[PDB]
Amino acid sequence: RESVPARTVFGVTTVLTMTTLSISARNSLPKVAYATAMDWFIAVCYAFVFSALIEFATVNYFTKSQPARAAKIDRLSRIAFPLLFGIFNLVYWATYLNR
Amino acid sequence: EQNCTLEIESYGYTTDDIEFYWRGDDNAVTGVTKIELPQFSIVDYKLITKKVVFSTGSYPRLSLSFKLKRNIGYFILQTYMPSILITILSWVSFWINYDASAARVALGITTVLTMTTINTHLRETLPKIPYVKAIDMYLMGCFVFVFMALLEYALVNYIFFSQPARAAAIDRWSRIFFPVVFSFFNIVYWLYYV
Amino acid sequence: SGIVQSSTGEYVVMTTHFHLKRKIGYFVIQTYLPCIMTVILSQVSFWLN
Ligand SMILES: *[C@@H]1O[C@H](CO)[C@@H](O[C@@H]2O[C@H](CO)[C@@H](O[C@@H]3O[C@H](CO)[C@@H](O)[C@H](O)[C@@H]3O)[C@H](O)[C@H]2NC(C)=O)[C@H](O)[C@H]1NC(C)=O
């Protein structure tokens, strides 16, 4: 939690990587007027990256003032984020592969 | 909305020799409601018969006019959502403490880079239309906000050592008043372009 | 109207020049302003300690 520059560059350039992936991924789709399955997947993943950065921002803001809170939200996120992304993937794949 | 027409005239015969009308006069054009465009949506079609007047006489004419209303959800999802979220992500640097120089520089400058990348890849994906458009105005607005956020950080860093109090006051004011200005910009833009 | 001389003879030629002026408003906000803001941002680096 105390390595602010490393975590900040990590998150922000992860967002930039996601942006490049989204842009490259939409160069294949025909210009439809609505969201494809891959569009939902990309938007959800992009939101996850944005939320991880926001989580780090909260941790940094409450560190040095409520370090108990900062460590508590870190330990909670380590178990929340993947446990929510995995179930999202399961539901998405289950709904789309069976149609 | 793009009003796209089809004009039907007679080349050599004037109204003194030939007269045009729609057979049915309201059902003459069929199959239009069943048209499924990928990017638009026919909201209405009109049938207009008339006689146009030129020098050597009046020539008959019919006109089939479609009104195509462009679907928006795609453009939202692909262009606006990334830019808005990158603007917010640029804002994130304000909650990062003043000492975190490398952190706030990384965030702001990478947000500028990402905004440039989005702009210069949508410049290719979008049709090449060499005059200014509302999408371009919005992308410029987001870029200018990222620019202002990074300049605000630069000001804070410059004036800090002389007066932490004013540094922190500036930081808090910007924290409270860039979201305000961004909402104001969004409201004016979306109400002016709709 | 003019006369063109070629290896085959002299021919009448009816010319019509159409005069066009390019718009700038797109390149202004699409290249010039991003470039100017990038240079301004590069200079702003001097204000940091
Ligand atoms: C797309 O644009 C064209 C061009 O303006 C629209 O055609 C216009 O439609 C209106 C409504 O039918 C016409 O007004 C009519 O004028 C006649 C004059 O003889 C009058 O008798 C009618 O009572 C009515 O006032 C207008 O003339 C016509 N313009 C042209 C140049 O044909 C068309 O409606 C648009 N497409 C849409 C709305 O889907």
Distance B46 CA to ligand 1 centre (A): 8
Distance CA A87, CA B190 (A): 36
Distance CA B74, CA C7 (A): 60
Q: Does B136 touch chain C (CB under 8 A)?
A: yes
Measured in whole angstroms, the distance separating CA C30 from the mean position of its chain's CA atoms is 14
Distance CA B132, CA B155 (A): 32
To 5 degrees, how large is the angle CA B59–CA B60–CA B65?
Answer: 125
Mutation pick for ligand 1 pocket among B47, B52, B65, B68 (CB with most ligand atoms within 8 Å):
B65
**Residue whose C-alpha is closest to residue B98's, from A69, A53, A60:** A60
Which run of H or of E encompasses B101?
Answer: helix B101-125
- The ligand 1 atom nearest the CA atom of B66: 39
**Which residues in chain B are contacts of C27 at CB distance < 8 A?**
130
Resolution to 1 decimal, in Å?
A: 3.0
Distance CA A80, CA B137 (A): 39
Query: What is the 8-class DSSP label of residue B31?
Result: S
Experimental technique of record: cryo-EM
